[PDB]
């Protein structure tokens, strides 16, 4: 029976690709809801009217700073309690629990009080890193399963029973991670839906919220050194607010349900027992013992730079340069333009399959380098609306660079390590270093300028990144063996 097996493996490949698309769309919806709610809460709390009239003596800046610190410092404990927890719950089960913690953070935003919002921030900071770690592990293992099914179909007896791929699953992993990251970046534009439809028509023009701005651009001396006290021309009706937040909760629950229903199960009880056979006492030290790896010692600055540049695109650009001329009316437009640029660069890098591995990577960084130049000398004037297309130009270019660098890091980390425990370990370390970079940039607030550190880091990693590739061709020979 040949055609029956053909149909069987066709259903299998269809299930693989549909679970991949489901996980991608779940990432999209969850991250979009999270960014939208976070932005709405940070903007709605920067005024006197909504702070004193609705709440008064509740301490909105204090609870906001406590939420921020609980989200930004908990990744340490997250790393301290992620590997054994992921191997306990599972690859898709930690995905589901982290999406549930995100939805919990969205839910506890209705009343907004200390004892209900601070634990939510702690849980979010605990679940942010292992969410992405398990996501990368799941998507890479599913790409490997897709490739192994394809090569079992095309090669029945020619394919060995042990070790099918041998570093050849790149054409099937590139096309998966490209669409995954394009959807993750389209999430950034989807996050701008509540602001455009509900919040963009409640704040006045830039002629009043941008008065006390005497120095912007290269002379920032902080995230927001000069700004008006209030930005809302009128108080937002609570009915529209509850409507938009109910829509957010509904789409979050829809993402929850579609993930649960279309993710299936990719843990494989046999391999689950295999991983349990490792033990609980040695799994706690193995990620820390993996420091002796030759690749991680040079790839850690790459993770730091990825985190630095993604947080610069999130806050350093929207609140540092886009706020110069125009106020908060065209910031969501800059964000969606950056998102579309990243989504386009996703397929632009997908088209880079024929070229070898470490070709666009440093080039992407080089892009930032060029952009960094334009971010060092040129300084836009705040009280003028002359040239506005250059902002969208730099936003699109930074999106291209960021998406290219992120997808290159993902594909390289999936290619260099093909084993399941290796995949989980390296993804965990990479995402922990990214969280540490985010925390450092959080500590890097209220600073004069973060461009010199950024450019020195990009120049330290370009040479370093090339460095790592120059020794793999000469056959150095080193790999940690912790079975």
């Amino acid at each position: 029976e040949e055609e029956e097996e053909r149909r069987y493996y066709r259903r299998k490949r269809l299930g693989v690709v549909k679970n991949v698309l489901a996980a991608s769309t779940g990432v999209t919806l969850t991250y979009g809801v999270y960014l939208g709610l976070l932005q709405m809460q940070l903007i709605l709390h920067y005024d006197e009217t909504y702070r004193e009239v609705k709440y008064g003596n509740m301490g909105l800046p204090d609870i906001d700073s406590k939420m921020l610190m609980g989200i930004n410092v908990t990744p340490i404990a997250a790393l301290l309690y992620t590997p054994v927890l992921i191997r306990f719950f599972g690859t898709k089960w930690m995905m589901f629990l982290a999406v549930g913690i995100y939805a919990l953070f969205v839910s506890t935003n209705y009343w907004e009080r200390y004892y209900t919002l601070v634990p939510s921030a702690v849980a979010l900071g605990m679940a942010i890193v292992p969410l992405w770690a398990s996501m990368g592990n799941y998507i890479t293992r599913m790409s490997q399963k897709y490739y192994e099914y394809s090569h079992y179909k095309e090669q029945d007896e020619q394919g060995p029973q042990q070790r099918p791929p041998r570093g050849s699953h790149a054409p099937y992993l590139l096309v998966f991670q490209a669409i995954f990251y394009s959807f993750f970046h389209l999430s950034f534009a989807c996050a701008q839906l509540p602001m455009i439809y509900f919040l963009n028509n409640y704040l006045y023009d830039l002629n009043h919220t941008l008065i006390n701005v005497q120095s912007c651009g290269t002379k920032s001396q902080g995230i927001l050194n000069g700004f008006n006290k209030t930005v809302l021309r009128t108080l937002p009706r609570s009915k529209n607010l509850i409507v938009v937040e109910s829509v957010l909760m509904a789409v979050a629950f829809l993402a929850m349900l579609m993930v649960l229903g279309l993710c299936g199960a990719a843990y494989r009880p046999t391999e689950e027992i295999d991983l349990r056979s490792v033990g609980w006492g040695n799994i706690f030290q193995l990620p820390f013992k993996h420091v002796r790896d030759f690749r991680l010692r040079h790839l850690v600055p790459f993770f730091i730079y990825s985190g630095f540049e993604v947080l610069f695109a999130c806050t350093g650009f929207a609140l540092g340069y886009g706020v110069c001329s125009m106020g908060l009316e065209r910031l969501a437009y800059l964000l969606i333009a950056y998102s579309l640029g990243a989504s386009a660069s996703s397929v632009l890098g997908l088209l880079g399959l024929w070229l070898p591995r470490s070709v666009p990577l440093v080039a992407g960084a080089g892009l930032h380098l060029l952009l960094t130049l334009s971010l060092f000398f040129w300084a836009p004037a705040p009280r003028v609306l002359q040239h506005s297309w250059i902002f969208y130009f730099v936003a699109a270019l930074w999106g291209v660079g960021s998406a290219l660098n992120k997808t290159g890091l993902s594909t390289l980390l999936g290619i260099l390590y093909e084993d399941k425990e290796r995949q989980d370990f390296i993804f965990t370390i990479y995402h922990w270093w990214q969280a540490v970079a985010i925390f450092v940039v959080y500590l890097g607030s209220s600073l004069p300028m973060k461009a010199k550190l950024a450019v020195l880091l990009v120049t330290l990693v370009a040479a370093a990144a090339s460095y790592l590739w120059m020794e793999q061709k000469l056959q150095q020979g080193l790999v940690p063996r912790q079975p």
Partner: protein
Amino acid sequence: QCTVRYNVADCSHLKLTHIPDDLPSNITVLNLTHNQLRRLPPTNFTRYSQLAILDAGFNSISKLEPELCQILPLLKVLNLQHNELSQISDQTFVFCTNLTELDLMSNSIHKIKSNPFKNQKNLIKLDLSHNGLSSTKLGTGVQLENLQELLLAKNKILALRSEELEFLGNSSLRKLDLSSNPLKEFSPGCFQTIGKLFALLLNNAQLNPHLTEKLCWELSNTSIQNLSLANNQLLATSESTFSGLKWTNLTQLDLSYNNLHDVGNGSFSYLPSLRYLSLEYNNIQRLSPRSFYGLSNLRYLSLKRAFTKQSVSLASHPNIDDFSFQWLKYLEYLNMDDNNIPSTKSNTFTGLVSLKYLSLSKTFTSLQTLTNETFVSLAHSPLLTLNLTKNHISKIANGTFSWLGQLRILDLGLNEIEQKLSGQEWRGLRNIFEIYLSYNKYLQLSTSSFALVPSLQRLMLRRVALKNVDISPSPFRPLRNLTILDLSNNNIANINEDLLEGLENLEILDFQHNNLARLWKRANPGGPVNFLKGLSHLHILNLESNGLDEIPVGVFKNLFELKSINLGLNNLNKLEPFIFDDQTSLRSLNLQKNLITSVEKDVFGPPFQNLNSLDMRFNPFDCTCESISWFVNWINQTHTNISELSTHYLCNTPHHYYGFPLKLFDTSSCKDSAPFELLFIISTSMLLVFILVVLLIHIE
């Protein structure tokens, strides 16, 4: 145009010239005052021929149309005051029969040589005042059968002949007015021609003693009851002056503004039926016992400003002899307000067996100190009301009011009394009800001050500089039947707790301007004094302008019958909850010019349930949801009276809402409005249950 209400037409201050026709046809009142009508066209009143009364005063009508009275047969009240009606003809009022009241208060009518009052047999009130009439002749034959009120004041009448009054053959005339006319002589038999004369007024008639003597002789053998000679030139009275009035049954006599130098002995003897006597505003220099002889049935007498003036150039004091009012045994009301009598003699008020009401405000200029022998004359008189304000009283001796046993209302206010209240001054006042000690200079309370007066029901201490109030026992303790207690502007810093104890009958309490801030806040001897312990029947309460910055909880407990609270001009900012819980029958609440910031439900619930009127202007509200959301939601829905709502209700904070009216504040953008409170709990519960259930299910 003209305002229409219930069968009336308010068409006055509109400056209209023509006759309006837009008014309904079933109307009965027409008010056209202060307009510029030239005349009344008798053709345009056909549409509303059912008019009952007509008012066309303050206009310039020159002639009246006789048809005007036949086209509206329901005309009963006709009023043409301040018009320019030149001459009256014979056929003018010859069709007017249903007429009842004719008012011609000003038309400059000089001569009337016809019989215009022949057919108005239903006429009751006639007014021809402020005209140029020189004779009281209104016709030839007897007419005006139902005439009762005839007014002829402010005319140029020089004589009252007997022939020019024969038309009142048998007409029961009730009120006759000849004021402001310089009559020089009275013809004999003139008043005898009138069928019945009840009242007669000659105010400002420029009579003399001989003139009023001849008038009194002419006024013999008639039924006159009320007589007024006010604003006259009656310099002095004699016995023969009022000799004619003995036959008639006079009831009320008025002698005001006559500048009477003196009263002759026995000049009032010939009158035995006099009941009301008025001697206001004269310059009497001497009084004698024989002067008031013959006034047996006198019941009303007033001597307001009846004595000699101050006379700064030459010092003169009018003296009154003893036994001046002994003949007045039936006198009930006696008044000598604003006089210059030096003091009270031993037997001034002797002989008044039935004196009940006596007013002595500003009568004595040098009384100063009362004595027990001062009120000895009034011992046999059952006085019920006595007034001593504006008397410059300084001291009160022991047993001064002992003779006045049946005294009920006593007034000592507006004086300079500077003495301690020992308590023996009120001896003998068993039936006293109200005591007025307001606006006095300086007093000192004592434990036995009000002990002899348990039956007291009203007491006033406004502006007295009260001292020694915080003593045990409370001086107000024996006042078992005390109902109204008024002490304001005393500046009493320390008040003991035992004060106002056992005062169950206490209903009204005034406590304005006494500085009660230090006593309540956090007292050094202990805690809140809560002097309102058992004042259950308290109804009206006032604590304005004491500068209190907080209200202790429990001071208003067991205060059910309380109706009104006045806490204006205070410094309170924070109000403890459950302070107004017993205030369920509250009607009026005043909190103005305070430091109130937030109004909350747990504080203002019970009082706002049945509150009638409230005043809370001039207050710095905090225009925030958590502060005033329930306040705005209540004031929007409720219908209670609010004075100056959108004008003096402002918000000082926040700075964005500085100088913004409280009514324009919107509560839709508040936390309590939207149900995210329930939405959060239901979403969190559902999500936690879902996660836990699915995780425990797929694990096993």
